[PDB]
Amino acid sequence: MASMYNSDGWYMGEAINMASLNTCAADLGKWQNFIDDYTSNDYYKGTPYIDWVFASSPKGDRWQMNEWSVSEMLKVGGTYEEGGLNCMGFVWHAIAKGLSVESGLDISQTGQYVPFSSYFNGLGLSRKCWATPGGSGGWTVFVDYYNLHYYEFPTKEEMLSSGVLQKGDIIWCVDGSVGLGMAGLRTIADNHHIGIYTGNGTSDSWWQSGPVKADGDLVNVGTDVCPIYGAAAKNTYVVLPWAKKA
């Protein structure tokens, strides 16, 4: 069976709850309902995928188009009409927005409880993402800080046959040009890719901004539900479960 690393630690929902100082419940069912609703409406779908790591402005919240960030957004294909997203920026926004819907708090507050990049805060925009009290940030820092439960899979087939995945889990595709599994994710790389699982436990389905057609294809890109395709040609997988499974 699949061995869970950091087995005595915390699930993603629990970690977010802690980061929020118990202001956000991060309930699995509500997150799943949010995913169903916001994959179907016109808030995210259709937002251009753009090659700026800090892009986090979906069609429904085109916020970076109305601050100094607009210049960087425009260079890489962001638009005033539909905004623009990159992969981590999308997952950050989706989680933050879900927490805002659940709690009634403004997304500007809930985004502070969700990891993104350790350099997003230093960029100097109006919104901030999670950081440690010491000022570090990003996904592997979050995993280590909260001792997050995680799984590693060398193949997509192993992941999808493991019985571990639930809708709402976070999946990282780890660029096989820099490493395998979690160790690979700790290494700076061109093409690690993140998304939110939307399948039934065995189906190949996730919600992401990035490749929608094939592993390694960065021409055919968008913000949508699609199979789990990496930005890299070769991938292994890290799963950060949202909550304990049924």
Residue numbers in the entry: 23 to 268
Study text:
R. flavefaciens FD-1 is a gram-positive cellulosome-producing anaerobic bacterium that possesses the most elaborate cellulosome system thus far discovered in nature. The parent protein, RflaF_05439 (accession number: ZP_06142651), consists of a tandem repeat of two conserved modules at the N terminus and a C-terminal XDoc, which also binds to ScaE-Coh (unpublished results). In silico analysis of the structure implied that the protein belongs to an established superfamily of cysteine-like peptidases, termed NlpC/P60, and this domain will hereafter be coined NlpC/P60_2. The NlpC/P60 superfamily of peptidases is characterized by a conserved catalytic triad, which contains cysteine, histidine and a polar residue (i.e., glutamine, aspargine, histidine, glutamate or aspartate) within a catalytic core.
The X-ray crystal structure of the second module of the tandem repeat of RflaF_05439 from R. flavefaciens FD-1 was determined at a resolution of 1.38 Å. There are no significant differences between the two molecules in the asymmetric unit (RMSD of 0.06 Å for all Cα atoms). The overall fold consists of two globular domains that form a tight interface: an N-terminal α-helical domain and a C-terminal domain comprised of 6 antiparallel βstrands covered by short α-helices and loops. The potential active site of NlpC/P60_2 is located in the channel groove that runs along the interface between the N-and C-terminal domains. The crystal structure of the protein module described in this work allows the assignment of a putative function for the RflaF_05439 protein, which is identified to be a member of the NlpC/P60 superfamily, possessing the characteristic conserved catalytic triad residues (Cys109/His215/Gln230). A fourth residue, Tyr71, is also conserved. This residue is important for formation of a putative oxyanion hole, which helps stabilize transitional forms between the peptidase and the substrate. In the NlpC/P60_2 structure, extra electron density was discovered contiguous with the side chain of the catalytic cysteine, Cys109. This extraneous electron density was modeled as acetate. In any case, is it likely that the modified cysteine would lead to an inactivated enzyme, which may explain why attempts to demonstrate protease activity were unsuccessful.
